[PDB]
Symmetry: C4
């Protein structure tokens, strides 16, 4: 019912249903997120910016609220939003 | 003597006596927090915003001080305050 | 040669020598830190603010540089400095 | 093919190829990083500032972009840049 998303060593735990709200995104589509699945550790691994992911995850948890963390510059966060295919 | 609270993968450890100071809150009421308990892991699980939780825990630690962290926007923090029933 | 310091669920790992450099403080004095030792998990446990502790630990690691994390208000951080007996 | 970097208890995970991009840095040089390796913990351990490391990692992830995080003071960050041999 929940999966583990490991962002450069930082492990997040989220419900599958939470991710399923946005099926056109990377994490919302099983076919896209499967490219980052690590079958040996039973988790999805992303070699990316850690401080951005709290906000990416919150976008799903909140049902659509996208906010940039103060400590992540706009150009860096905008690249993460593009990578996670939230537009 | 200690309880584990897992906020989307991030684990917090707090004495039950400290939560018990505020019985009208979610975490201070046995009936309410039981809805989020996981017997296998012996922890409470919330699929919620991570940055906000340091200030939620500080509310219990400080004996009732409610302080918004500078990196958590006011509308987000106010929703977390209402969810955990700290008002 | 290393000890584990658990601040409300957040585990820090520090060389004993790093702490020993300031023997008049809580963590640098064997008798003061012993009050917070947990023989079950072989770690020191503090029911305190998490965001402050990176800075407290960095005071030892850097050989004496004490800086307040931008995300922790001055009154809260000053209370932590007193608790850890850094003066 | 992954490397675990433990900064005072905080674990970071990166692909070895990512560090390998910059062979003249501490983490990109096998001989230099070997001094910090722990065979019994298959990880490299640094007793250093935690908040600075997200930005050290982002230098490798970004293909060489060096960005001072907003809540890490310049003198502290500059010392970490020097220690990891990024310049």
């Amino acid at each position: 019912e929940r999966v583990v998303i490991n962002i450069s060593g930082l492990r997040f735990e989220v419900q599958l249903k939470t991710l399923a709200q946005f099926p056109e995104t990377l994490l919302g589509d099983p076919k896209k997120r499967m490219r980052y699945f690590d079958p040996l550790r039973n988790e999805y691994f992303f070699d990316r910016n850690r401080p951005s992911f709290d906000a990416i995850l919150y976008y799903y948890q909140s049902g659509g609220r996208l906010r940039r963390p103060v400590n992540v510059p706009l150009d860096i966060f905008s690249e993460e939003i593009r990578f996670y295919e939230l537009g």
